Ligand binder design. Structure first.
Ligand SMILES: Cc1nc2cnccc2c(=O)[nH]1
Length: 164
């Protein structure tokens, strides 16, 4: 069902995550972590303290799809075991040092063709698939985008509701 999902998404904030490669999203799915550039790390930390749920919606460049979405369960933290991200050119491990813990809400794909009717007011009302890494998605657009994903029956949202 979709009712617990709607409860998790109620008054959430939503951010677009754009990865150049599939390997980093697969690591994030396996380890429940994500790291981003400092300019976005600061925005996510502010958002984490400001809202019941902060949702990251992931898309791999050139894939034509979103790969899933997840909820921040912590602010960024430093000093843990290094995650072996595949680092894009011009991006170093020191730049991705801040690690957020995330709980996946959906690990299934959504092709851009299914989200063509959704535009993001915070990016000039361009289709929601369009945006730089870290682009915030307005509440209604983001909620409808997350509801478009096929249900992920492997996930039990009871545990993430308790974290709100
Ligand atoms: C973990 C990580 N991977 C990426 C891959 N491509 C572009 C940006 C990123 C990023 O901010 N973080």
């Amino acid at each position: 069902g979709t009712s617990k999902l709607k409860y998790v998404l109620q008054d959430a904030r939503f951010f677009l995550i754009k990865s150049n490669n599939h390997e980093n999203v697969s690591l994030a799915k396996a380890k429940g972590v994500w790291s981003t550039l400092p300019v976005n790390e600061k925005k996510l930390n502010l958002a984490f303290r400001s809202a019941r749920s902060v949702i990251l919606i992931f898309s791999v460049r050139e894939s034509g799809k979103f790969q899933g979405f997840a909820r921040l369960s912590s602010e960024s933290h430093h000093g843990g075991s290094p995650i072996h991200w595949v680092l894009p050119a011009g991006m170093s491990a020191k730049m991705l040092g801040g690690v957020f813990k995330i709980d996946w809400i959906c690990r299934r794909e959504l092709p851009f063709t299914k989200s063509a009717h959704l535009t993001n007011p915070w990016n000039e009302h361009k289709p929601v698939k369009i945006g730089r890494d870290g682009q915030e998605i307005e509440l209604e657009c983001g909620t409808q985008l997350c509801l478009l994903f096929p249900p992920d029956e492997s996930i039990d949202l009871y545990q993430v509701i308790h974290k709100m």
